[PDB]
Scaffold this active site. Structure first.
Site, PDB file in Angstrom:
ATOM      1  N   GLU A  90       0.979  47.576  37.063  1.00 42.16           N
ATOM      2  CA  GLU A  90       1.423  48.358  38.213  1.00 42.16           C
ATOM      3  C   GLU A  90       2.352  49.496  37.802  1.00 42.16           C
ATOM      4  OE1 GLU A  90       4.297  46.734  41.437  1.00 42.16           O
ATOM      5  OE2 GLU A  90       2.257  46.621  42.235  1.00 42.16           O
ATOM      6  N   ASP A  94       1.559  41.601  53.241  1.00 43.75           N
ATOM      7  CA  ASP A  94       1.932  40.173  53.030  1.00 43.75           C
ATOM      8  C   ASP A  94       2.625  39.726  54.337  1.00 43.75           C
ATOM      9  OD1 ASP A  94       3.081  37.724  52.434  1.00 43.75           O
ATOM     10  OD2 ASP A  94       3.419  38.426  50.289  1.00 43.75           O
TER      11      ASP A  94
HETATM   12  O1  LIG Z   1       8.668  45.363  42.691  1.00 43.07           O
HETATM   13  C1  LIG Z   1       7.281  45.271  42.458  1.00 43.07           C
HETATM   14  C2  LIG Z   1       6.727  43.832  42.641  1.00 43.07           C
HETATM   15  O2  LIG Z   1       6.858  43.541  44.029  1.00 43.07           O
HETATM   16  C3  LIG Z   1       6.420  42.195  44.328  1.00 43.07           C
HETATM   17  O3  LIG Z   1       6.510  42.091  45.728  1.00 43.07           O
HETATM   18  C4  LIG Z   1       4.975  41.923  43.936  1.00 43.07           C
HETATM   19  O4  LIG Z   1       4.629  40.532  44.046  1.00 43.07           O
HETATM   20  C5  LIG Z   1       4.760  42.257  42.472  1.00 43.07           C
HETATM   21  O5  LIG Z   1       3.361  42.140  42.149  1.00 43.07           O
HETATM   22  C6  LIG Z   1       5.285  43.687  42.168  1.00 43.07           C
HETATM   23  O6  LIG Z   1       4.511  44.605  42.907  1.00 43.07           O
END
Ligand SMILES: OC[C@H]1O[C@@H](O)[C@H](O)[C@@H](O)[C@H]1O
Ligand SMILES: O=c1ccn([C@@H]2O[C@H](COP(=O)(O)OP(=O)(O)O)[C@@H](O)[C@H]2O)c(=O)[nH]1
Ligand SMILES: [Mn+2]
EC number: 2.4.1.40
Length: 291
Positions: A240, A263
């Site tokens: 990411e 979510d």
């Molecule tokens: O801060 C970034 C992260 O945020 C979380 O909510 C998510 O589960 C991770 O995959 C990543 O995207």
């Protein structure tokens, strides 16, 4: 070459009436930001069916994550690109664990066996390499969409997303200032983004584009990950972080709103979301990622 659209009767767009006043619907580089109420799906369906568009969907189901495939695929059949040609590519280390899901006409599924890495981080990161089998997609689909498997479709996800290159706003950050985005902040990483740069925080769980642009993106992110590995650095949020750096420097031609990656357990159902289209399936990170 594109033939004419047929006669169609629909409400006239009103120039002095915005579809949405509450949200930004076009980026500063004139890419639409796709929210409910910004598109007439009948116009867009006609445009894309007149091109006989085929959409490929890639999804990785490695180790325990094969358990997510049945719901992922059966809800994709109800909500993803219905009416259009769809080719699912399920990448997995357990082909015999892929559920037999019934598919609508014009839709097919290929099982692509791949190795399983031990670390969930490498499983997630190595999707860029895996995607980037390239001559195959160029012959079989027009667009590629690349998603996480621990997800379900709850509403329409269709040709309104298709464009040469898209990312999706991460649902945790769409109202955040850029200094709060969790970009890679160490200058030693290829994914580094300074505190005064960044348009949006994109989600690693849903991006896509034409085949050419998706192979460009996934090749560039894999190359950048290999540079980091050689330098002994792993970005803070893995693929990411690299996707974010790539979309900063190569602006997407559409951006999906968080309707497209939500979510509901963590974030509920805010008024700004008229539809929740593609949502997380609750899971226990520690249990599902390790033997
Ligand atoms: O801060 C970034 C992260 O945020 C979380 O909510 C998510 O589960 C991770 O995959 C990543 O995207
Ligand atoms: O053991 C694993 C870990 C990850 N994944 C794939 O990598 C994606 C990203 O990981 P995950 O969904 O765990 O990340 P999160 O959304 O929880 O941050 C998953 O959706 C799967 O496609 C997988 O197949 N098996
Ligand atoms: Mn996920």
């Amino acid at each position: 070459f594109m033939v004419s659209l047929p006669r169609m009767v629909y409400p006239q767009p009103k120039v002095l009436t915005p579809c949405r006043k509450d949200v930004l619907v076009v980026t500063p580089w004139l890419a639409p930001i796709v929210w409910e109420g910004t598109f007439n799906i009948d116009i867009l369906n006609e445009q894309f069916r007149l091109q006989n568009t085929t959409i490929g969907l890639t999804v990785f189901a490695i180790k325990k994550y094969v358990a997510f495939l049945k719901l992922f695929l059966e809800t994709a059949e109800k909500h993803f690109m219905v009416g259009h040609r769809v080719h699912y590519y399920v990448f997995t280390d357990q082909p015999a664990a892929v559920p037999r899901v019934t598919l609508g006409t014009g839709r097919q599924l290929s099982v692509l066996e791949v190795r399983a890495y031990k670390r969930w981080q490498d499983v997630s990161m190595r999707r860029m390499e895996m995607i980037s089998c390239e001559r195959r997609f160029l012959s079989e689909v027009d667009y590629l969409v690349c998603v996480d498997v621990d997800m379900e479709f709850r509403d329409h996800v269709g040709v309104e997303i298709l464009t040469p290159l898209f990312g999706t706003l991460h649902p945790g950050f769409y109202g955040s200032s850029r200094e709060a985005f969790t970009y890679e902040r160490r200058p030693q990483s290829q994914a580094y983004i300074p505190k005064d740069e960044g348009d949006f925080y994109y989600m690693g769980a849903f991006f896509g584009g034409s085949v050419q642009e998706v192979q460009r993106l996934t090749r560039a992110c894999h190359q950048a990950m290999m540079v980091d590995q050689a330098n002994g650095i792993e970005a803070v949020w893995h693929d990411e972080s690299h996707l974010n750096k790539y979309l900063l420097r190569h602006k997407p031609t559409k951006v999906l709103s968080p309707e497209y990656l939500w979510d509901q357990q963590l974030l509920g159902w805010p008024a700004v979301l008229r539809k929740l289209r593609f949502t997380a399936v609750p899971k226990n990170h520690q249990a599902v990622r390790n033997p």
